[PDB]
Amino acid sequence: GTSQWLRKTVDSAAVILFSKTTCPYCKKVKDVLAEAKIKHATIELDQLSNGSAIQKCLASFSKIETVPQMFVRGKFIGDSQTVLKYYSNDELAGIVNESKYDYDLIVIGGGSGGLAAGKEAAKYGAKTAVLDYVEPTPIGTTWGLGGTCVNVGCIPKKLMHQAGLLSHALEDAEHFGWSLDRSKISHNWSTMVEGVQSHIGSLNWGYKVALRDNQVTYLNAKGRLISPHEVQITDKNQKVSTITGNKIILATGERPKYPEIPGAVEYGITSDDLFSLPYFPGKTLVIGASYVALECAGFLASLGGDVTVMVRSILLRGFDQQMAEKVGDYMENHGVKFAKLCVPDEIKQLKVVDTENNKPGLLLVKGHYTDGKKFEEEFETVIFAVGREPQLSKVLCETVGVKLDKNGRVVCTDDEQTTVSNVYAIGDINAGKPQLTPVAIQAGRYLARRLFAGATELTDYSNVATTVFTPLEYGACGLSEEDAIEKYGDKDIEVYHSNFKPLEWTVAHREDNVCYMKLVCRKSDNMRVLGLHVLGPNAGEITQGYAVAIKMGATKADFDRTIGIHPTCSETFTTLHVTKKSGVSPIV
Amino acid sequence: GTSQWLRKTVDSAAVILFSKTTCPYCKKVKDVLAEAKIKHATIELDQLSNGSAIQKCLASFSKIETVPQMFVRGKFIGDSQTVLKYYSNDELAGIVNESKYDYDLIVIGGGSGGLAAGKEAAKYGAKTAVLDYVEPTPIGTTWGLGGTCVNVGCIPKKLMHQAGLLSHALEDAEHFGWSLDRSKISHNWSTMVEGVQSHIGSLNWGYKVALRDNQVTYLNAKGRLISPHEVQITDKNQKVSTITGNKIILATGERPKYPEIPGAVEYGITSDDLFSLPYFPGKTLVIGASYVALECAGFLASLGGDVTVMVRSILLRGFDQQMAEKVGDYMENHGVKFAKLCVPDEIKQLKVVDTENNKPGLLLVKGHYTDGKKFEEEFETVIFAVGREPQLSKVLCETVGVKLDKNGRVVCTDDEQTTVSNVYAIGDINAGKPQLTPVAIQAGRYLARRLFAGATELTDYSNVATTVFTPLEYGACGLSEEDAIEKYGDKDIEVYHSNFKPLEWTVAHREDNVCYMKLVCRKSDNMRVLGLHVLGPNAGEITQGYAVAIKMGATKADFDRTIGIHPTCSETFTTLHVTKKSGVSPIV
Ligand SMILES: Cc1cc2nc3c(=O)[nH]c(=O)nc-3n(C[C@H](O)[C@H](O)[C@H](O)COP(=O)(O)OP(=O)(O)OC[C@H]3O[C@@H](n4cnc5c(N)ncnc54)[C@H](O)[C@@H]3O)c2cc1C
């Protein structure tokens, strides 16, 4: 057991020192490596449960049982005297840089997971390259380093959501005594986009600075894995070349899908285009019903746009459908129109986009409802949000031998290993995992530590909390009510629930009984909390802390014995008592 | 064991039915009690794991071992045949109303704790009276039912905090693209006060409706306990009379203190007056440094006032002092002035309050700094926030025998019992307990269930979370860092910390490294989280959910394995790594 861990660590680590905190011979070697600017991992044996067994096991590689012992890429280098011999003779730098490969690690993809993996690996002395290339959208949109979340995802969408939230802050301010007249204030799209894009630009630059200061090689090039250790790269001049790496991490993410109908690619756009669009979209149609579709429709309506959402079947498929229906009902009462049970058939162009005068075009959308009836209406902008997919045929030659699933995602072990032993996959392309930015970052950092610092900790993908940033936000952690009932049976499920009203909404004359929360619990397991759900302002801040308690196995009694903080929205979770089975109203 | 519980339950329940869910004779008795509008507690013997022992023990009271058994105020009334006999002979109503006392429960004080206890007790058939009287302030201010939080505490102060927060929302809206000009907008104090007071009035009315609908007698009269079971009452016509009760709950709260200096009572005010003041306070001095002092100074400054705070020694004595200093530094950078190490000596009147034109007066304040230098400045309003105190001599004759501590608070057992066996105390007057509204509510409800429904659950007063609603909010749960070190020693404490920047602050050009959070952990107990601290927006929403995890004994490893929600402020708690011992900077 211990023997197999130590073998794996020695073979994989780039530069690793086995040391003790008390030893001055170890302090002597650490200081030498620091002066020579040699980064390395360190294992302190006097601080591990079974460091005494490891010390004896090191002898199988070095034939000595003492400390310090320094290894490079699986090879024993020497003890104190020998390392200082190499340093005094100017032989050290050459020894620590000898490798069968150009790099200890090549990361294909410079997004959430890839940048986190590459930076963490470099901390332990791995010689690392990060490759990133942004294939342009059909109308030619492109952006800088950092991936989907930074450039065309979580960051710009939450900034535009905040711009939408401030419209109701302006309305509320009158009732709290401020002298403004909300009816005479308007919004400027391009001023918003300029501020959002300036922030994104500071993140692009910050990542390039971060990589340089960690001695990571950044190549703005398209990568393709052609054999287990060879990556073919193509740069901006279509210069093709080949680099080699010991370990490979695939982290290339996904892009938006388009439906197979006339005019979609030619005349519609996706979220990839929306966040840097140089003109206001105007009267807009959003096709789809995912969290992307609803978040974008929501802030466009709050900025004063004429917005319609066309829904094929249900909202937020895969989320709790009671909460999804409450989300949509709020949006419809606050100025989002819905075309329900409806799909598109074709998009026709009536006016070309006026790139000169900074104006949208004009389009005719034709479709049909699910019973047979027809749809026909004109829009200035049409946004498709009908899912996202990887395209690993661009990234990965089928001869390498990496197994994909029926959706095109990489099949991995619980330590992110593919069917090719030195190749790993993280983030949205890892089959079956939640497609979220903090998941990708944790997977990447934790993997880098296992490869290059002898760590053993795995990423836990269960009960990962989420928030949908619709105009009224929806936070969740754990099972939906319908999934719990299917898994355990209705007689074993108890649901506590309540409406609430934010104190901030009282003076502002907002709605009494639209905010809502529930706990879905398992009777036969001490009323264990299976799922937590909340619709209300600041829902992500409310939900986050409870995710720790659910990870630790919270019960209803744990929520009951904890005291609330007053006045807050969150405290309503500490005093829930109305059950669904009782039939008593949840209103306040 | 079981037998001592049953005896305590039977003696103090007002009306209680011992039952089993399966029994149709029990269902027949339940149906008769409902039809006669007789409220009662019910104990289902087949839902308790030692119901068989309880059933046998009942025979010691009734001479029978079957269910149903009905008891009234300690006396066995009958089985099924006997209860129905009383019903059809019109004898039952008189039996269930037989009492040595006017009431099963008298609550002295109609605030957070007292209202909660009274409503819960009435649910189990206790005949209940709630007494409430508001002694006017020195200038004559008074208010309605509901206590300090509802009328002159948490509720109005968080509403005026929200009005202050909206000033920076107006500022931020320009950077997100809205056309308003913040420099042309001003605030109207009386409009805000009118909206706050209309909400408070709806709460006053809602409580009177709730007591009527639970059949609780509300007396707007001052109460005085003159013997264990006798309460002397004085009404608004100064008519004096005496009522008797079996159990007594003391829940009379505290009122603000004044310093013993010339002019304080005559010319200054307290928070009791501020929340309904008919004119804007104008240039204001706040004397004191409690959370009340800083919260009030903070919103007055955000509403455009010229505000100074006079601090005797430190801010937020008893809270973590690193966090307290950050709170004050933020206020001082955003337009609160501070007179540090300074106390007042007298207040002189220069102008009387102008009640016609709705304007404050004018005052001269003289004081001194701790080195002896003099303070002298004019203000329109002086607010004293120098602590709160009970005055139980107005509530409690000394011959009753209820023990008080050195501060005048009631010394209680861990089930809220005083030194007089039928008298209990809850809320701010219970010595040693956190003085918070949700604590008083939990204590009151849990106590009512133990007195009248045979419950055993105690209130848990440890690790109760708090939030200070200063202009930048401060949330906490558990020990301060200096208390952790004093208790365990510096070598056993590790502190993880980080600055952060809300995403909402980026486009708005707010500060990079003012928001801050830390976890104070115990090394030798598996890195147990002893305390959590966060300075930032929505800090109460952030903190609440983590209080459940701390209640269950969370460690740093539990925070690490839980995944963040992105983008949120709260997620920074899931990835902390910089220790204070390392000396590495916490800036981001
Ligand atoms: C509109 C939208 C909103 C979102 N909002 C949230 C939110 O609020 N919270 C949240 O947690 N998640 C959110 N997400 C999801 C989040 O963006 C993703 O889960 C995350 O970005 C996935 O990270 P990744 O590292 O797997 O891939 P990515 O971040 O997509 O990075 C992959 C990178 O590799 C590049 N690449 C691809 N092929 C190659 C190649 N052959 N060679 C070189 N480089 C290549 C890609 O162009 C890209 O730059 C949102 C997503 C979208 C689309």
Ligand SMILES: Cc1cc2nc3c(=O)[nH]c(=O)nc-3n(C[C@H](O)[C@H](O)[C@H](O)COP(=O)(O)OP(=O)(O)OC[C@H]3O[C@@H](n4cnc5c(N)ncnc54)[C@H](O)[C@@H]3O)c2cc1C
């Ligand atoms: C400015 C301010 C802000 C606060 N903010 C918060 C906050 O954000 N969160 C929080 O949790 N707590 C807050 N508190 C504390 C909270 O108000 C108290 O902890 C809570 O109200 C205590 O409730 P209680 O039932 O003990 O007493 P109270 O709510 O004070 O009720 C006691 C009642 O009994 C009445 N009474 C007194 N003597 C008699 C008598 N002889 N006969 C009859 N009736 C009598 C009193 O007039 C009063 O109506 C704040 C307090 C202040 C002053």
Ligand SMILES: CN1CCN(C(=O)c2ccc3cc[nH]c3c2)CC1
């Ligand atoms: C009765 N039937 C139709 C509603 N429903 C939805 O999925 C739904 C809910 C709300 C909104 C708001 C806009 N679109 C919506 C669709 C399923 C149940």
Ligand SMILES: CN1CCN(C(=O)c2ccc3cc[nH]c3c2)CC1
């Ligand atoms: C050395 N001493 C300096 C003062 N200090 C405080 O506790 C404090 C007091 C008052 C204000 C007002 C704004 N920030 C403040 C900090 C730290 C300890």
